[model samples]
Target: ESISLLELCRNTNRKQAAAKFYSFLVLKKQQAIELTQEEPYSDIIATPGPRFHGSLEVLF
Candidate 1:
């Protein structure tokens, strides 16, 4: 989400590899929603991803 597929690959120096990886993620996200819609979960599901902390040398 932070960057587009092109940008990610460019920053990581994996332009060639990302073409495949980006397509896979698109397919996987679609499948996830499709499967969930059919099953219909009873409770709200919270799917959170990685959380990074910033460097704070001083805190008051």
Candidate 2:
């Protein structure tokens, strides 16, 4: 069941990088419902370029 990264989407590419990005997309979409209208999941650093929601910080 877990052996299906390509079966999900074509954008998931570059060797073993699929599942990682897949999980990221999942969290950004599924788990982010709690932060959609309040403060957003990726707008604090709108220009700085990062995903910060108080707990974890993703630097870009």
Candidate 3:
């Protein structure tokens, strides 16, 4: 990944929002993974929340 999470929003107002949003997404992913591991056959899955896919352009 780009770690350019910082560079993509370089010198822009979204720099802070970018960092916070990225952290939030990561945490959500981790939580989902944990749940899946703890309950593999619960018919649940680790999926991303509703968000703009445009952000992926900046993250990956």
Candidate 4:
């Protein structure tokens, strides 16, 4: 779920671009896709979230 500043910019949809960058710098979080499992809240661990998708932007 980690990406560099460049990649985040590419994946962002003009609108969500700000949200994505803010999530990184403010929340200090990496992008994560919640996999659809039989029970997402269950104690069953599933896949490793995809990472190589977007660029990383730091918040002001």
Instruction: Say which candidate scores most in TM-score.
Output: 4
- Residue-pair clashes per prediction, in order, are 0, 0, 0, 6
Colliding pairs, model 1: none
Provide C-alpha RMSD values for all models, in order.
12.9, 12.2, 11.1, 12.2
Q: 1-60 in candidate 3: lDDT tens per residue?
A: 113233444565866756754664574565422113235423322333344333334433
Q: Which TM-score value belongs to model 3?
A: 0.30
Query: Using Cα atoms with residue i matched to residue i, what is each candidate's TM-score against the true structure?
Result: 0.26, 0.27, 0.30, 0.32
Order the candidate numbers by lDDT, best to worst: 3, 4, 2, 1
Candidate lDDT scores, in order, read 0.32, 0.35, 0.40, 0.39
Name the weakest run of 10 consecutive residues (lDDT summed) in model 2: 41-50
The lDDT, on a scale of 0 to 1, for candidate 4 is 0.39
Clashes of 2: 0
Task: Give the higher-lDDT candidate: 1 or 2.
Answer: 2
| Per-residue lDDT over 1-60 for candidate 4, one digit per residue giving the tens place of the 0 to 100 score | 333433445666876866754444433333232232355433322222454233222221
Q: CA lDDT of 25 in candidate 2?
A: 56
Error of 4 at 18 (Å): 0.7
